[PDB]
Amino acid sequence: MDEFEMIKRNTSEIISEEELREVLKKDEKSAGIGFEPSGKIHLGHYLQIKKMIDLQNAGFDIIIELADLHAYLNQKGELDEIRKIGDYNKKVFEAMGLKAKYVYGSEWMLDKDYTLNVYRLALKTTLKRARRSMELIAREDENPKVAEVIYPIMQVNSIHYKGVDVAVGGMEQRKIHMLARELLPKKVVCIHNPVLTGLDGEGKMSSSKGNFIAVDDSPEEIRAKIKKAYCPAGVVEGNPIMEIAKYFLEYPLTIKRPEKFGGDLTVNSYEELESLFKNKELHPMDLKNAVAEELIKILEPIRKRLLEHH
């Protein structure tokens, strides 16, 4: 692959491709993503950090916002506690191999100039639009707070303030990103990563829904989680195990199985793996076993770096 196709790989959408082409030519180009600090860092975070790495390899300076005020506004607790978890997440992202500028949003979100532009943007952001942009982000609340509609403006403002050429996020960030593209003088290139399905297939992988594999889960726990995971034979869509094979595993992939079940199977691409699964040539139990053992090897250096701290 070339640089553009390496950035595009395993993304849901790039907004837009020609604009990304314009960016790649620059000697200096920056790319940002922000994370509300999370008690566990899971495969959904890893997918996005993997993509920030792809950009760093393509010559981007990477900015990681530890979004403490966003988490505060989205009801994750008190600021000092959120910042502690932010610092923990930083260590995890470094353990994943991302050397970047890790910044707390509150480092600039209280500047007078920034705050004035929050108010400028509030004047151009309709309440309906702001709520639409938060539908997949806002913490469930039967009595939604004003903080919910401040949140999207502040993300747009930070895209403006930190001056990134590229914003990266999960597909759930797309409407906030389409606000930023509409409201800001410089249109940011937006790279949207897929939203992983949760292990039970009930919804999306979520830190608060307990349907995730954490990057520092133990081998036994990964095996237990994958064993129980939704994985209907032949079904690829909404299949979290097929998702993990697509987004995290390396190919060629040797799938070990007994000779009585057709013997070990070497598949050279996820597309062949999908073909072998769509028609029950590969059983869920054998897919799960290989997905488990290979995911373990992938996360091992991460877990190990984190374990060494003890």
Add this chain to the structure above:
Amino acid sequence: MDEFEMIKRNTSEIISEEELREVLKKDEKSAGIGFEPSGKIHLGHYLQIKKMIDLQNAGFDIIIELADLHAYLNQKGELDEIRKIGDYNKKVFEAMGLKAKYVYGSEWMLDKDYTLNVYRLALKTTLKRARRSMELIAREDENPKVAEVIYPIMQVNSIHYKGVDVAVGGMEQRKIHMLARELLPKKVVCIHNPVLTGLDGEGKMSSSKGNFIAVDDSPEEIRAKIKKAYCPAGVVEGNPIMEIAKYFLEYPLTIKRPEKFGGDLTVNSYEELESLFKNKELHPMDLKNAVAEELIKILEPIRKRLLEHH
């Protein structure tokens, strides 16, 4: 009257009376109101400044917020223009005889501490509540902006930040004030003045509805405005002319009229005036003539101070 009854006079409500009693005892007590800067200063503004004067006479230090960022958030234009009109309004309020601390909201509304508490309060203010509190304040907008729900939080925050014991406003400010009483550690005493009816009786006196008498209107213009004004015989409620007699005129009041219409009439109180009007003992034309001529004499020193600037 004593101090409490002088403050209460011609108010719609005091929240609450016992709390105001506690305040009056203090050697130092402050009272605030804020005005979005307005191209014309009208009898509605004067009624509130008259009440700030009542408080100043009762030993309050008065704070007048020229609410430039509020007007900005409520779509009155650009900040520099709004501030010009703010400075004009200050001159008008001084011409009314109020010597006070006149402060632009933007002087403190961009402080880091203030802005952080905006976000704290956004977490405790529901979007429904915030919109309810703005129903009589927000500029008409088919596509309401996020600025609309930031506005009420910022007013509450300023009540907190500027530390007033008493907040004064028209009845349309009551729901914002009931937020401040619920959210802030120190419960502010709220003094609500009536909302004057517009001259056509169609609604409330408004700077943007052209149904007002401005304090610097010329005598001929006051007469023309009062002549055309809604004033049905016997009807006192919603009658702007009866309102002006109640809130602005001094009693005893001599009402001049021809001998053929019963001759000049001296009424010692608005209550007697209301009695003489409820049963058509006093005609609208005669009420209007006296209300016009006496309102002119009341506003004359104000108009004159303002004219001297030319």
